[PDB]
């Protein structure tokens, strides 16, 4: 679990969005596993606007942060799960690192701010949904 709170927006994994997220929907994209909903309180986070490929993410299954080198946002095949059919997920960045079910929502940050959130995982792999292109989160 986990969310980014920026301005009057909350960014979550689309597959973990609550009834309240859908009732306050701003934007969602099943191909990116992202959903953004509106909030009344002002957020705590700031978003990176950069091309970093290294950073640090939070891994809830280890209660720890780990450094990572990750690929640029791209279209990557993701196997079927209870949440989605087998499909290509866009704007996904892969890295070598620990991940297990329950780790989605963990934040990836670089020196400039929040880069994205954990969205997928494999055997020694972790995938992050990028949010750096969503320029409207800031205004
Ligand atoms: N973005 C999606 O399509 C995700 C929907 C929820 C399911 N999903 C995953 O990847 C789950 C997952 C599977 C794992 C793992 C870590 C994670 Br996270 O390590 C070993 O096998 C895919
Ligand atoms: Zn950066």
Curated annotation (Swiss-Prot):
Coiled coil: none
Residues the entry annotates as binding Zn(2+) 1: 50, 52, 110, 112
Substrates-to-products reaction catalysed: Selective cleavage of Tyr-|-Gly bond in the picornavirus polyprotein
Superkingdom as given in the UniProt entry: Viruses
Role, per record: Cysteine protease that cleaves viral polyprotein and specific host proteins. It is responsible for the autocatalytic cleavage between the P1 and P2 regions, which is the first cleavage occurring in the polyprotein. Also cleaves the host translation initiation factor EIF4G1, in order to shut down the capped cellular mRNA translation. Inhibits the host nucleus-cytoplasm protein and RNA trafficking by cleaving host members of the nuclear pores. Counteracts stress granule formation probably by antagonizing its assembly or promoting its dissassembly.
Quaternary state and interactors: Homodimer.
Name of the molecule in the record: Protease 2A
Organism the protein comes from: Coxsackievirus A16 (strain G-10)
Part of the intact protein present: 869 to 1007 of 2193
């Amino acid at each position: 679990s986990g969310a980014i709170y920026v301005g009057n927006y909350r960014v979550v994994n689309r597959h973990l969005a609550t009834h309240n997220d859908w009732a306050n929907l701003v934007w969602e994209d099943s191909s990116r596993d992202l959903l953004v909903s509106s909030t009344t309180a002002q957020g705590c986070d700031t978003i990176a606007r950069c091309d970093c490929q290294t950073g640090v993410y939070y891994c809830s299954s280890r209660r720890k942060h780990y450094p990572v080198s990750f690929s640029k946002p791209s279209l990557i095949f993701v196997e079927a799960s209870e949440y989605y059919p087998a499909r290509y997920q866009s704007h996904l960045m892969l890295a070598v690192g620990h991940s297990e079910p329950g780790d989605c929502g963990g934040i990836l940050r670089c020196q400039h701010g929040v880069v994205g959130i954990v969205s997928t995982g494999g055997n020694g792999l972790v995938g992050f949904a990028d949010v750096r292109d969503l320029l409207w989160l800031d205004e």
